[PDB]
Amino acid sequence: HKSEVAHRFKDLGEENFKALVLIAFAQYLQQCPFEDHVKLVNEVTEFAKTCVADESAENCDKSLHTLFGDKLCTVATLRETYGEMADCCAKQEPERNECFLQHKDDNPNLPRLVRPEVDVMCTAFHDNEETFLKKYLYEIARRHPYFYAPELLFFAKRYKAAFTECCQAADKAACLLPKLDELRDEGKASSAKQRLKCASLQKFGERAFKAWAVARLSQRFPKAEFAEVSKLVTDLTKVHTECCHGDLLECADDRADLAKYICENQDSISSKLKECCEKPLLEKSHCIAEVENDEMPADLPSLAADFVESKDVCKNYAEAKDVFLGMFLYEYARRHPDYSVVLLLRLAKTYETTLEKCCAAADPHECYAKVFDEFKPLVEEPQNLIKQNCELFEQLGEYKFQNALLVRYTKKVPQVSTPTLVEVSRNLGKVGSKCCKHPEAKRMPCAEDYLSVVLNQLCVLHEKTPVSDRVTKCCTESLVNRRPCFSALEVDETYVPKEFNAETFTFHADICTLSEKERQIKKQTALVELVKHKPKATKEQLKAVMDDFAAFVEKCCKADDKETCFAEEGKKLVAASQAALG
Ligand SMILES: CCCCCCCCCCCCCC(=O)O
Ligand SMILES: CCCCCCCCCCCCCC(=O)O
Ligand SMILES: CCCCCCCCCCCCCC(=O)O
Ligand SMILES: [Ru+3]
Ligand SMILES: [Ru+3]
Numbered sequence: 001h002k003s004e005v006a007h008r009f010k011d012l013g014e015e016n017f018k019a020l021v022l023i024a025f026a027q028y029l030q031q032c033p034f035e036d037h038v039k040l041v042n043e044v045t046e047f048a049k050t051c052v053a054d055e056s057a058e059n060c061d062k063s064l065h066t067l068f069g070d071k072l073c074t075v076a077t078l079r080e081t082y083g084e085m086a087d088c089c090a091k092q093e094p095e096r097n098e099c100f101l102q103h104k105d106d107n108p109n110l111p112r113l114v115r116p117e118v119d120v121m122c123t124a125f126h127d128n129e130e131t132f133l134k135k136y137l138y139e140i141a142r143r144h145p146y147f148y149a150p151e152l153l154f155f156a157k158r159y160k161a162a163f164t165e166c167c168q169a170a171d172k173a174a175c176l177l178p179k180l181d182e183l184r185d186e187g188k189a190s191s192a193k194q195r196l197k198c199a200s201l202q203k204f205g206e207r208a209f210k211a212w213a214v215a216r217l218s219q220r221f222p223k224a225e226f227a228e229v230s231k232l233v234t235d236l237t238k239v240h241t242e243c244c245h246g247d248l249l250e251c252a253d254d255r256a257d258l259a260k261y262i263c264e265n266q267d268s269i270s271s272k273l274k275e276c277c278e279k280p281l282l283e284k285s286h287c288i289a290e291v292e293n294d295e296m297p298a299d300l301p302s303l304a305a306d307f308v309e310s311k312d313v314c315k316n317y318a319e320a321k322d323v324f325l326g327m328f329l330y331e332y333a334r335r336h337p338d339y340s341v342v343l344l345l346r347l348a349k350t351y352e353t354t355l356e357k358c359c360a361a362a363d364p365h366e367c368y369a370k371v372f373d374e375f376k377p378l379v380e381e382p383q384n385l386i387k388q389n390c391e392l393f394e395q396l397g398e399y400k401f402q403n404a405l406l407v408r409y410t411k412k413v414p415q416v417s418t419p420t421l422v423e424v425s426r427n428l429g430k431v432g433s434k435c436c437k438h439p440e441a442k443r444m445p446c447a448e449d450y451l452s453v454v455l456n457q458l459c460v461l462h463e464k465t466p467v468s469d470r471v472t473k474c475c476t477e478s479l480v481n482r483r484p485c486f487s488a489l490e491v492d493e494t495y496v497p498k499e500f501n502a503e504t505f506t507f508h509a510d511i512c513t514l515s516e517k518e519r520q521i522k523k524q525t526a527l528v529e530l531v532k533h534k535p536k537a538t539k540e541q542l543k544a545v546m547d548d549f550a551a552f553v554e555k556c557c558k559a560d561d562k563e564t565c566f567a568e569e570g571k572k573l574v575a576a577s578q579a580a581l582g
Contacts, residue, residue, distance in 0.1 A: 003060040005067060006051035011281055016153070018045050022134060023149040024248060026141035028072060028100060030108050031081040034138050040071060064249055065097040072100065101246040104145050113139050118176055122167035133160055144191050149248050154286055155187050185430070192453045198244035200479060207322070208479065210237055214326050215333040215344040221270045222296040222334035226327055228268050235261070259284035270294045293337045303331055307351070308371060314359035325352055338441045340448035343382060346480045347375050385487065386443050390436035399520060402429035406524055407542065410531040412489040414498075415468045418528045420461055422521060427454050451483060491535075498532045505529070505574050508566055512557035523549075534581040545577045 001007040009017050021041045029037065044067075051060035059067070072078075073089035088099035113136070124132045137156045141147070162183070166175030201209050213233040221229060235258050243251035262269055263277035263284065272294050276287035307313060307328060317324040329348050336344065351371060358367030393401045406425040410416075431454065435446035459475035466472065470492075474485035504526065511522055530545070531537065552573045556565035 002055045003051040003057075004062075004064045005048045006055055006060060008064070009045075009048045009052055014045065016282060017048060018042075019134075019137070019153050019156070020149055021045065022138060023141040023152055024068065025071075026138050027145040027147070027149070028085075028104060029075065029082075030105060030110070030142040030145060032075065032077065034135050036075070037138060038134070040074075044071060063093070066093050068249075069093065069096050069100065097247075104246065106145060108143065108145075110143055113143070115180065118167075118173045121176075122163065122172060125163045125167055140187075146195070146246060147191055148194060148243070148251070150252065150282060151190065151286060154283075155183060155190075158183055189450070189453050192456060193449075194243075196452065196456050197240050201240060201244060204479060206237065206241075209240070210234075211326070211329060211345055211348065212341060212479075213237060214329045215341045215348075218330045219333040219337050219339075219341065219344075220291065220293050222294055222337070223271070224269050226330045228265070229330055230326065232258075232262070232269075255285035256281055259288055262288055296334055296337070300335055303328075303335075304372065306331070308368065309365075313368075314355065314364050317355050318359065321352075338444060339379070340382065340444040342448055342480055342483070343379065343444065346378055349480065350374050350378065381484070382444055382447075383440075386436075386440075386447060389432055390443070393432045393436050398429060398433050401432060402426050402520075403524060403527060403546075405429060406527055407531055407539075409489075410528055411491050411535055413468050413471055414492055414495045414532050414535055416462075416471070417465070417467065418525055418532075420458070421528050422524050424454070424458055425524070426520075427457070448483075455482060455486065495535055497535055498529070500533055501529075502574065506566075506570060507553075509556070509562040511553065512562065530577075537581045541581055544580060548573055548576065 012020070018041050021044050022037055025037050025040050050057045054060070078086040078089070082103070085100065085103040088096050088103065091099055133156060141152060144152070162176055162179040166172050166179065169175045210233050213236045214229065217232050217236070218224065218229045239251070239254045239258055242254055262273065266273050266277065270291065272291050273288065276284065276291055279287050325348055328351050329344060332347060333344050354368045354371045354374070358364045361367050392404060396404060402425050405428055406421065409425060410421055431447060431450040435443055435450065438446050462471050462475060470489060474482060477485050511519055514522070552569055555569055556562060559565055
């Protein structure tokens with residue numbers, strides 16, 4: 001186009017343009033106040049209207065990176081608050097924009113965004129609605145810089161739907177709090193999911209990411225031919241390559257072009273895209289990525305007719321090992337939408353290792369005749385782990401299930417810090433809360449997706465604090481081996497039990513008057529130090545104690561005398577559990 005700003009101002013809208021421009025300058029100017037960005041956003045949008053009224057006005061034909069970088073150097077505090085980033089303004093445009101992406105700080109040093117009371121949020125949301133959503137959007141963007149700016153706009157529109165519906169209701173906290181926590185746990189999961197694909201691209205190479213894209217696209221698009229899925233995997237690998245680079249316009253255009261090809265080839269990809277392709281350009285890439293798995297033709301035959309019993313299997317493989325193996329991922333994923341994508345890569349590696357061993361023998365057909373028999377143990381292993389834990393989640397509650405995990409995983413790796421073991425077991429319990437509530441045809445894709453972000457969060461906290469060698473080995477291993485590595489952990493026999501500290505196992509009358517979240521944290525934090533003090537404690541002993549602690553809380557909180565009860569009964573509970581866990 002003759003003017004980049006005029007075009008993007010048209011096919012996005014003025015309300016969407018000012019929002020993205022705010023997120024743009026918030027991720028680069030993470031130290032300027034909110035009033036400065038509003039000054040810049042209003043100066044940019046007023047300039048954008050000049051190019052809409054005339055495509056040949058002052059500096060309208062310039063590039064967006066030039067207009068973005070020109071505004072980036074207008075700030076006077078650029079030399080003081082960022083300093084080194086101000087040096088980028090002395091380079092040419094193809095390097096200046098590259099200079100700005102490097103000096104972007106991933107993890108700044110800002111306070112946490114404290115969630116205030118519902119009354120003060122519904123008053124600010126009602127008094128001045130626009131600046132309320134923009135300020136908090138400016139606070140999320142300045143703390144998550146590499147977050148995809150358009151996708152961050154999709155969450156802000158969801159928050160707006162939570163206030164308009166709940167801030168005029170009965171107990172607004174009953175309407176809003178289960179929604180803000182939903183949007184937080186989902187928003188933090190999206191921030192960690194896209195950050196994981198960048199690590200998996202530079203650690204496992206370009207080939208490993210393509211195998212993952214082959215298995216998920218063919219799973220999502222079973223009616224698509226292998227040539228069409230292979231074409232999409234190449235474009236998909238290019239998108240996440242340049243989106244992880246840090247550039248917004250470079251990543252926004254690649255995703256927009258990919259969505260246009262998918263919408264122009266719905267007859268050879270999927271039939272579920274009618275609704276997604278109706279949406280405008282901003283929502284195309286987001287809708288398509290979350291489209292439901294299409295139905296398989298159901299008339300598909302077995303895989304032994306082309307990969308086992310057929311002739312020239314070693315010939316079709318040796319001619320192109322990556323093309324032949326990718327078909328095995330294609331032909332197996334679209335016939336198993338219930339398998340996790342990581343599980344399908346585990347089967348293809350089994351098929352890959354078998355062909356490299358059988359085709360080097362005298363009689364190949366007799367060798368790999370049992371290649372499909374090796375898949376059943378690898379497939380039953382995650383299915384049985386889903387069955388064991390979901391049945392445990394059916395008996396116990398969600399809270400009682402978290403404690404079962406908190407005891408099981410503390411005895412395996414007792415060296416991990418207590419606050420880490422708590423947040424892990426509670427986030428891990430949230431996985432079974434919604435994945436076990438799905439049928440068996442969706443349990444493994446659910447568990448794979450949430451375990452991927454929870455296990456990676458564990459490895460992030462363990463990377464900045466080396467604690468256990470067994471945890472480091474599982475965090476360093478491959479993608480198909482990461483989750484089985486954690487499931488293969490056993491009880492640490494070399495662990496010396498931690499010395500007793502009475503201050504930890506002392507409880508005061510404040511737990512009678514804490515929120516349900518704070519109460520569950522303290523009951524579980526004390527359960528970790530209880531196991532770390534006596535790791536060889538059997539479960540029947542822990543059925544007690546925890547029941548003696550249940551009566552200890554009901555005896556002190558309900559009595560007319562508090563604080564004093566925690567001193568008398570607190571000594572009885574501790575000392576009785578001393579001889580109970582002998
Ligand atoms: C002057 C700052 C400009 C910041 C970027 C404004 C235009 C963003 C366009 C985003 C298009 C998204 C396409 C897509 O993901 O489907
Ligand atoms: C042109 C399409 C190429 C698709 C290549 C897929 C190859 C998958 C082989 C199995 C990979 C298992 C993971 C690994 O070996 O690290
Ligand atoms: C030897 C120290 C004894 C006192 C500490 C015991 C800690 C028990 C924690 C119980 C947590 C679960 C409570 C519940 O079921 O709601
Ligand atoms: Ru965050
Ligand atoms: Ru993606």
